[PDB]
Amino acid sequence: SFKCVNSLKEDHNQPLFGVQFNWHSKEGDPLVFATVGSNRVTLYECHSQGEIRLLQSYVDADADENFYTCAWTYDSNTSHPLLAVAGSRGIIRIINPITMQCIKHYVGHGNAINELKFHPRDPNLLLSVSKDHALRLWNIQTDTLVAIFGGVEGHRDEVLSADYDLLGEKIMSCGMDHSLKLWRINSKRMMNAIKESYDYNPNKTNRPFISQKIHFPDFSTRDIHRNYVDCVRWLGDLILSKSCENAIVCWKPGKMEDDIDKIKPSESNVTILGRFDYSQCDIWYMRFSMDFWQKMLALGNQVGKLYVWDLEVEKCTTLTHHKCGAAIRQTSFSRDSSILIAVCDDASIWRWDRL
Amino acid sequence: RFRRADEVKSMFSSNRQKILERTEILNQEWKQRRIQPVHILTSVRECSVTSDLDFPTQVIPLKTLNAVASVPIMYSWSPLQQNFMVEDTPNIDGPNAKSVQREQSLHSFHTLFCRRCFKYDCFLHPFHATPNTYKRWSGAEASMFRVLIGTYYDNFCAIARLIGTKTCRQVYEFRVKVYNYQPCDHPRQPCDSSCPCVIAQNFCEKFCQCSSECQNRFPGCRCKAQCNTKQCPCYLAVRECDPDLCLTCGAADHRDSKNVSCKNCSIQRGSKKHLLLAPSDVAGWGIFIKDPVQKNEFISEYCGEIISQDEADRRGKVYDKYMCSFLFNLNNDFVVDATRKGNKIRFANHSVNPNCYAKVMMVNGDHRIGIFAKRAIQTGEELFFDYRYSQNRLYFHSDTCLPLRPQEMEVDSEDEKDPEWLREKTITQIEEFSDVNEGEKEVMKLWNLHVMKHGFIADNQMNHACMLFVENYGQKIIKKNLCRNFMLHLVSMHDFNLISIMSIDKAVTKLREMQQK
Ligand SMILES: CC[C@H](C)n1cc(C)c2c(C(=O)NCc3c(C)cc(C)[nH]c3=O)cc(-c3ccc(N4CCNCC4)nc3)cc21
Ligand SMILES: [Zn+2]
Ligand SMILES: [Zn+2]
Ligand SMILES: [Zn+2]
Ligand SMILES: [Zn+2]
Ligand SMILES: [Zn+2]
Ligand SMILES: [Zn+2]
Ligand SMILES: [Zn+2]
Ligand SMILES: [Zn+2]
């Protein structure tokens, strides 16, 4: 369904573990994506005739950092984009590509950080999934740690991925403990945190802002996959999540007809709705992605086959090229779902266009 | 088979419309914003990109990020103050009632109550209440009387005052027609060399059911104060005073207070000094102390999870790979583990020339690990102790590992008695019982929270514990319709030999004063 038109390579030959198109792009403005890897984030623009233009690049002060992921977000009242990046050191920098300086930084995660996402309806709430067994909900606007997901009933091993739902009401996480845990965020207890995290003021009250430790998930299960889980994205009220088993799996928790907004924590049954079967992809940390209207599903593997899927099976169309050789860590479509950028282990990029 | 294939797509397509209708509102919110794009940098060492397909190789300057001070490694743990043990009948209150014996109406209470810590299905003591520890017209109104004939004996004009729905003498017709301590129990047998306490080399405590003057019970001490030198047999036996026995030193005086006359009970009350977290001067996270501490003064209870020796053996496999063990031997049979749940003091690093030491003292049957100062400690030293014997700076928060600036580091003390996760976790464990009815369940939840809110640790306190429960939570008792189960709770308290008889009369009196209002 696609067609490749360009290939790239950087100057460090180190792996790149994620890319995102800034889906907050304007209407009629050029498509822009960003690349994390090594100790450096590189931003890129698209142009006519398969030209990929190099915009700007930022390197962190020490070469020991190994960035893993990134995600875009607009400012509320300044209209600039912000691209938060986090890696092995567990620090989350912001780095706006307008003034080109580390505008904010948040220390204090217990280990590395393995995935980042933003709330869909609030561009001020940032969720970080960490190796320290816990998820954390930051607040870019007001410099406040809202929550910590993972206490006694939290993720007992290393956590690797999560994703908000579509409307922005219920997070779902997973990690190297074979578990997928739903943490709703529409309860009035999580909501009065988001409210009071704005009306907090450091020099207005000699009392640090009360961060909400969530010890008990709103649902948990280890019945879907066998070994570790390294990716997870919502599907509205269904959930896709893969493992090193050469298969992305669809599933809803509870019974078939039991609504997701009424399933209470102690529910133990699932309903596996099927699997997307693929081949040769079976190592640590290999995500997928989906376009903005969620008809596409793109995954890469270790030898360079760049799978695609039609999500309206109401069709294992593949993408392969003679030089696409190393592994594919992550893919990301453009907002209008026209360009598919994939990154590799040998510090290379590939640009695919739909027709 | 043909049925489930058809339910997949009917739900898929209904789920699909949910995708469409939601994704539009995000798209509609996208047409609201006019956000600027990314543009190249000509303002400013250099990065370069080549193309594997015939295209000019592009170079731009490399904008360096300012360095950011990293923090040491820390894994997800949960706040704790009192230890945590780990493993390796119709309702008589509302519309549907029944008439059962004395033991069937109270069955869940005798088995689910803990004689030692005063909570239902506690978290420390796994063994249930030993047998003789709990022996000292509709269907509901009649099953109540059935409970009282074992408790209220032959008083007729008073039993009618309780049940309220009938009157005095008409009742007649019903009458017509180093090892861990566990309480020892053996009727018709004295506490001899066949007793678990004697076999374990442990003294029987107040919880034992052996004879009152059993030759194995620890008696307590008669000191006037301090209890802090070899002179006091409580101290001399490596024990904290028993606050139902040592009435002279102060372990039973001013339970609200934290600095009592008796100084050898600072663990059971939780009078632990203030601890602060910061990066260690060796490597990693370390703990420092806020205010100065004398020689041989109590710092904190080293707290954690209680695991078996067999569970400690499996966890010693996983712990060995990081060269970092956080477990300590509590006694021969049990081990404490601060890796998953612990308190602030679990951040004391090892050193062979330390200023603190660990003493495994005994508190009301429970062996606990106390941390004490080996010498005097002044403001801002990092506390160390030797792991072998038991197995102007930047301060950080405990729960979040964020910087705790000096503005409000005085009465913070992020270490209460009842944490938020336990107050819920005990509710999880009450409801999960499938053999207990939910009318009795919704009262034991109220008691467990009341106990933890005040911090009760003495048998003598239980008169005030049941009288304070009515003053605060009795309103939720009537609104949730549990006034009858609350009476069952009282006669279960009275069956366990730790409440006064006139308090059961005084407690119901204060409930009915608000009920008829
Ligand atoms: C199987 C689990 C494993 C055994 N485990 C459990 C815990 C609770 C824990 C921690 C941890 O909670 N610590 C905080 C801390 C405490 C609590 C107390 C003190 C005195 N001090 C501290 O720091 C850290 C590490 C770990 C691993 C590798 C590592 N290295 C790699 C980078 N280069 C330096 C060496 N560093 C630390 C392992 C842990
Ligand atoms: Zn107990
Ligand atoms: Zn009478
Ligand atoms: Zn005994
Ligand atoms: Zn005995
Ligand atoms: Zn005895
Ligand atoms: Zn004494
Ligand atoms: Zn004493
Ligand atoms: Zn004493």
Residue numbers in the entry:
A (entry chain B): 81 to 394, 400 to 440
B (entry chain A): 31 to 74, 81 to 124, 261 to 308, 432 to 472, 517 to 730, 2562 to 2687
Provide excerpts from the study.
Polycomb Repressive Complex 2 (PRC2) is a histone methyltransferase complex composed of core subunits Ezh2 (or Ezh1), Eed, Suz12 and Rbbp4. PRC2 trimethylates histone H3K27 (H3K27me3) to mark developmentally repressed chromatin. Ezh2 contains a split catalytic region composed of the SET domain and the SET Activation Loop (SAL) but is inactive without minimally associating with Eed and the VEFS domain of Suz12 [Suz12(VEFS)]4–8. Pyridone inhibitors bind to Ezh2 in an extended pocket that overlaps with the SAM binding site.
To obtain a more holistic understanding of PRC2 inhibition by pyridone inhibitors, we attempted to solve crystal structures of human PRC2 in complex with inhibitors that had not been previously characterized. We established a system to co-express a fusion of full length Ezh2 and [Suz12(VEFS)] with full length Eed in S. cerevisiae, and further engineered Ezh2 by deleting amino acids 183–195 and 341–427 to produce diffracting crystals (protein purity in Fig. S2A). Although the resolution of the crystal structure is limited to 3.9 Å, Fo − Fc difference electron density for GSK126 was clear enough to build the drug into the structure. Continuous electron density is observed for the body of the drug, while the tail, arm, and head regions are partially resolved to varying degrees. The top, right-hand side of the drug-binding pocket (relative to the pyridone moiety at top) is formed by residues W624, R685, and F686. In a manner similar to other pyridone inhibitors, the amide nitrogen and carbonyl oxygen of the pyridone head of GSK126 mediate distorted hydrogen bonds with the main chain carbonyl oxygen and amide nitrogen, respectively, of residue W624 of Ezh2 to compete with SAM binding to the same residue. Residues I109, M110 and Y111 of the SAL of Ezh2 form the bottom of the binding pocket. The backbone carbonyl oxygen on the neck region between the pyridone and the indole moieties of the drug binds to the backbone amide nitrogen of residue Y111, and the side chain of Y111 interacts with the indole body moiety. The left-hand side of the pocket is formed by residues 661–665 of the SET domain, and this region constricts access to the pocket.
